[PDB]
Amino acid sequence: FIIRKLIERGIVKTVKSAKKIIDKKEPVVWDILENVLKGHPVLLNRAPTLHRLGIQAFQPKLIEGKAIRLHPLACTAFNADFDGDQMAVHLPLGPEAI
């Protein structure tokens, strides 16, 4: 999606240049990603998935650090505490999936 926006903006014309720009971590990448995130939820999952509430869609926002920020009220659904638990993020692609 960032590559699509980079090509559309005229910054680059090929996929490889867009990938290089993304890997360089430029401010344009974050400017694109802020709008790319909107309306594109991610499925968060904690294993074991005992019931269907173990997979839940959340609208993501960019945050600092390397840890996923999870709403406390969802913890009971995930059986998730914050003593070292880990979560997986899956990105739906098609409009019907979103």
């Binding site: 269907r52 173990g54 997979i55």
Partner: protein, 49 residues
Amino acid sequence: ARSIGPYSLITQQPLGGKAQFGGQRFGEMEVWALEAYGASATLREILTV
């Protein structure tokens, strides 16, 4: 985090492990949850594409 990366030469599926730049496992229980929600499209994308 992985968007695309190395795949297996046998199963043609994403590898597993940070060192291998692999992808997360959507196991049987996750498929059960997806079926319970009724997401045919999300399950189909996870299974095939």
